[PDB]
Design a protein around this ligand. Structure first.
Ligand code: NO2
Ligand code: NO2
Length: 129
């Protein structure tokens, strides 16, 4: 599923991401835009053999099991394919564990490089929230 901007904002808010660990809703929408272009089916291979999955490009090296990242962890206790569903529950719940990890949203390379220190509120402008 490819989400609309305000559609994803609303779903993320419903799932309790707005101000989760102090990160406003705009931060999450911005991250999702630049990680996956709002596409739940997005996948990208990393140099180390792991893969990033879903709207927030959650990585198999630590967070999920894709059956092909040998010697990795499954800290969210899920198959990586769960991160590709039209239902974003699994992605959101795993993201909450990631952002609590100690590095906050810096865990997302695209957020650090493209969202951090910018007017992230613009990502929810016009939405009926
Ligand atoms: O959800 N369309 O911005
Ligand atoms: O649960 N919203 O995909």
């Amino acid at each position: 599923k490819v989400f609309g901007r305000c559609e994803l904002a609303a779903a993320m808010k419903r799932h309790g991401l707005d101000n989760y660990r102090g990160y406003s809703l705009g931060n999450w929408v911005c991250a999702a835009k630049f990680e996956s272009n709002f596409n739940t089916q997005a996948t990208n291979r990393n140099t180390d053999g792991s893969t990033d999955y879903g709207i927030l490009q959650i990585n198999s090296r630590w967070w999920c099991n894709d059956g092909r990242t040998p010697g990795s962890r499954n800290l969210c206790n899920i198959p990586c394919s769960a991160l590709l569903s039209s239902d974003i529950t699994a992605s959101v719940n795993c993201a909450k564990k990631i952002v609590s990890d100690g590095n906050g949203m810096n865990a997302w390379v695209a957020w650090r490089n493209r969202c951090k220190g910018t007017d992230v509120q613009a990502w929810i402008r016009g939405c009926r929230l």
